[PDB]
Nucleic acid binder design. Structure first.
Length: 276
RNA sequence: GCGAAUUCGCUU
RNA sequence: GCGAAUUCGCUU
């Protein structure tokens, strides 16, 4: 049975105006990075009007466009694609009901020409940070090395708490004027290094390291449109989450880039709309 | 988000 | 179970 491949076209048509940028984030046009998502199906998707999703960066216009049709795929590749599809909703979004068609998969350019990113899928399956927390072996003789490039489009997790279910953060800023020896926000500890040593008994091998600003990755399920004591408490906690300053040495980098993660959170809205 | 305490509304 | 109010704990 032949396949149809669609691209989930995303463009940021109305960036979030300053008066609405409460969390004071950078805005990230999806169109700025080539890797995106597509849909692979056995039957054609009826033409559907362009529609908005309202993301953190502003209003994004979604277009579902045909990329390829009439081709075949081997059982091996379909299995790989299926696994990644399942990975997206169970491990990235942590969602039991994808649509609040058949396989979502990553596309990338080969040259400005979108096709199935098999390499990326394989990289995910080989990653030691694929599911939870990868092992490390930092010592004085083999210390942690900070490479800025690895933090530019990164999602990170703390390696030292919550291991059944790690909190994933976007790296929002790299604070090059700070180190683990900078003064700690709470007065019960003098430094970041002391905090982590006293609380978790963690030793640092690198004391020249920049520190990181973060932005939680959590997103509401329905983004198709742009209160309570409970919502207050939740917003307060999110504010504190976002005030956290993390030590790169103490975090692991997730194999899914930040730019793709931002597109992932739109998927349920889009699949819901398609099934309507 | 994960938990806790106190108080109040909806049923006959 | 469906809701609401007030207060407190967990992150740096």
């Amino acid at each position: 049975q032949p396949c149809y491949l669609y691209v989930i076209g995303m463009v940021l048509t109305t960036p979030l105006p300053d008066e609405l940028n409460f969390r004071r984030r950078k805005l990230y046009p999806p169109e700025d990075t080539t890797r995106c998502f597509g849909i692979l199906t056995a039957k054609p998707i009826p033409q559907i009007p362009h529609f908005p999703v309202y993301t953190r960066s502003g209003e994004v216009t979604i277009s579902i466009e045909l990329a390829a049709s009439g081709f075949m795929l081997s059982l091996q590749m379909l299995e790989l694609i299926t696994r990644l599809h399942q990975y997206i909703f169970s491990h990235i979004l942590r969602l039991e009901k994808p649509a609040l068609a058949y396989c979502v998969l990553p596309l990338n350019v080969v040259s400005s020409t979108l096709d199935i990113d098999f390499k990326f899928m394989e990289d995910i399956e080989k990653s030691e940070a694929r599911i939870g927390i990868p092992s490390t072996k930092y010592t004085k003789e083999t210390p942690f090395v900070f490479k800025l490039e690895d933090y530019q489009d990164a999602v990170i997790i703390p390696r030292y708490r919550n291991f059944d279910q790690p909190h994933r953060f976007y790296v929002a800023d790299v604070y090059t004027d700070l180190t683990p020896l900078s003064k700690f926000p709470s007065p019960e500890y003098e430094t970041f290094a002391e905090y982590y040593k006293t609380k978790y008994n963690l030793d640092l091998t690198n004391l020249n390291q920049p520190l990181l600003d973060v932005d939680h990755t959590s997103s509401r399920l329905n983004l198709l449109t742009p209160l309570s004591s409970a919502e207050k408490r939740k917003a307060k906690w999110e504010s504190l989450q976002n005030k956290q300053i993390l030590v790169p040495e103490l975090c692991a980098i997730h194999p899914i880039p930040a730019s793709l993660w931002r597109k992932a959170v739109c998927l349920p809205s889009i699949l819901y709309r398609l099934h309507c």
